[PDB]
Amino acid sequence: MSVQAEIGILDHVDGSSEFVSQDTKVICSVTGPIEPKARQELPTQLALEIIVRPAKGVATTREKVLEDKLRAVLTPLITRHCYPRQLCQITCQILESGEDEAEFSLRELSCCINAAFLALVDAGIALNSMCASIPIAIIKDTSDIIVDPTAEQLKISLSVHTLALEFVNGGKVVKNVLLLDSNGDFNEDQLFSLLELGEQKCQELVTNIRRIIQDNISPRLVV
Amino acid sequence: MSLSVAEKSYLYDSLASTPSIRPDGRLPHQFRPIEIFTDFLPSSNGSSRIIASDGSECIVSIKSKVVDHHVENELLQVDVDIAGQRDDALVVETITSLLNKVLKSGSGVDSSKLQLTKKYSFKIFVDVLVISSHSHPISLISFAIYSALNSTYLPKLISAFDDLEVEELPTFHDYDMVKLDINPPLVFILAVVGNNMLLDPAANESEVANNGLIISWSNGKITSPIRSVALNDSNVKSFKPHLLKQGLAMVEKYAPDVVRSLENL
């Protein structure tokens, strides 16, 4: 396989999703809009308090760096002014990484971002645009780009890159780039190659997630 | 604070005048009734329960291990722990410091009553539990450590260890204990309210006092640590050299009697 996504699986929470990308498997919940804690009351804004918890061992400093990365992306995805003075806690539990957690975060991160989008779709919280994120590596053997890499391919990386882009006017016009985190050595001609490919490979992923939400929503909402 | 505004002025007046009368009504040289109870753990080297008149209670317990002392520069470890405070509030750890420095080796306390041959020292683990506090503990802890350390029994060496006896670990006699003699300091607390210097504040006195001076008595004389302390935040003032010299003079006179009454129960 490639990717699979389901929504609605969890029943006690306002919205939820299960994102699986090959070996990598992230299950997500959005809870809220709910009653703010006083330290997480913000005046005009919805608050975000994101938690990433790894499968193996217990969450550390790493997951805060991930939280920041997630929080960056999610702040213009969720309509902040939609709820003033309410909190939303997004709790992302990793059921399998299937890689090495300290070393590579490429698949882990991309998966969380997508499960967060879906969960928020199920939740009903306003979403301006479609977001997905794809993982891109470069392997040293050919000294070239391999899109959507497996666990083996990640080991033999010299460098690794995630991109996330905001999708409007048919979910197919790139509005903006909400992330481009390019770690390891790159020079510019690769990097604009990673955008280019990146564009088209994202838009496929957007098609697939788009399709999934319609099919799963449609027997629920009927007329 | 926990007292009245009216109460604090009455006290300030009372105490600050020539007689210096106070709720006990002591002259400045007198001490409240304390009760020493000892040796209640058969499991420990020595133990101490001291109940004071304000209803403050410290329990002080002496445990040990013999250790090679050439990999150590500490012989006495104080752990202080105050019921109803955690293990890292400012006052608790500051008390731990004071006490560790009072009991520091070669400084007002022996580092040769704790060694049984010149390679092996006993590391005495002082472990202090304050059962109730609502007044300062350090004086009462000092007094409790005295009675303790003169109730401290250690294992008696099997045989006179040399440092070349066979070059293996020292090994104790099965039943026979050695009495530990060792004279620890005694911390005494003096209080200044006006130009009047008074030995041993009660709780009430501590809450109106400008400052106090902690000083210690070791070995027939006064010695370091010396430290001033401010025994409130909100009735605080400054003081003069002459009043500090009169507090020296006062302890020198009134300390010896106390050590000798406390020593033999």
């Binding site: - | 753990l41 209803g55 209670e57 019921a83 683990f125 609502h134």
Partner: protein
């Protein structure tokens, strides 16, 4: 290593198979700054308890209209073992576990209903343990609360049984604890209804009745000392 029992009915303490340990207690050990207090000896388990309060807390969140808030703090010092405790224990699961057990249990024994907008703090300081300590802590609480004038339904009395296959040995020490499976039990009042049964070890289910039945007798035996101790004290302070 070592005998735990013999057909001749001895131990290495020298107790009998339904004999209790040394039970010594005395009440009011802090009668100048604690509302009730008691000292509990069972063996060498040396437990002091203080009850402080009933008092209102000065935090609104700890105020409760429907009943008092109850706090039980189990403090275990660094000289309860034979050696110096290297570890922090006042921030350990084992101790929070005892806390969560004593509080939920005494919360129903004590009437907190008749003390609304109150907080009670039970403060339990261990001075030594030599095992049989989990039943000994219950007993010290029970004498503290009755001294403090805090109403109750019954006395919970803790007692331990170690099963040496089919041979149940009432009361325990360090050897007994570390060399077989121990049961710990509590009964409330002179009832057969058990408040607390705690098992950490494989006890067979087929023999489950044999260890509890002797323990519910064994419990009654502890409870009459508690009454005797208390009425000898109450008679003293009503003569004067």
């Amino acid at each position: 290593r070592l005998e735990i029992y013999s057909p001749e009915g001895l131990r290495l303490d020298g107790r009998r198979w339904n004999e209790l340990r040394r039970f010594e207690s005395s009440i009011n050990t802090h009668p100048h700054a604690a509302d009730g207090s008691s000292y509990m000896e069972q063996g060498n388990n040396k437990i002091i308890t203080l009850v402080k309060g009933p008092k209102e807390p000065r935090l609104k969140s700890q105020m409760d209209t429907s009943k008092a808030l109850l706090n039980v703090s189990v403090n275990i010092t660094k000289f309860s073992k034979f050696e110096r405790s290297k570890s922090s224990h006042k921030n350990e699961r084992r101790v929070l576990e005892i806390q969560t057990s004593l509080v939920r249990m005494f919360e129903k024994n004590v009437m907190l209903n008749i003390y609304p907008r109150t907080v009670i703090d039970i403060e339990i300081h261990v001075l030594e343990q030599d095992g049989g300590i989990m039943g000994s802590l219950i007993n010290g609480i029970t004498l503290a609360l009755i001294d403090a004038g805090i109403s109750m339904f019954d006395y919970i009395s803790g007692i331990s049984v170690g099963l040496y296959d089919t041979t149940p040995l009432l009361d325990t020490n360090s050897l007994e604890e570390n060399a077989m499976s121990t049961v710990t039990l509590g009964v409330v009042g002179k009832s057969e209804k058990l408040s607390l049964l705690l098992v950490e070890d494989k006890i067979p289910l087929d023999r489950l009745e044999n260890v509890l039945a002797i323990g519910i007798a064994g419990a009654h035996r502890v409870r009459d000392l508690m009454d005797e101790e208390l009425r000898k004290h109450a008679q003293k302070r009503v003569s004067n």
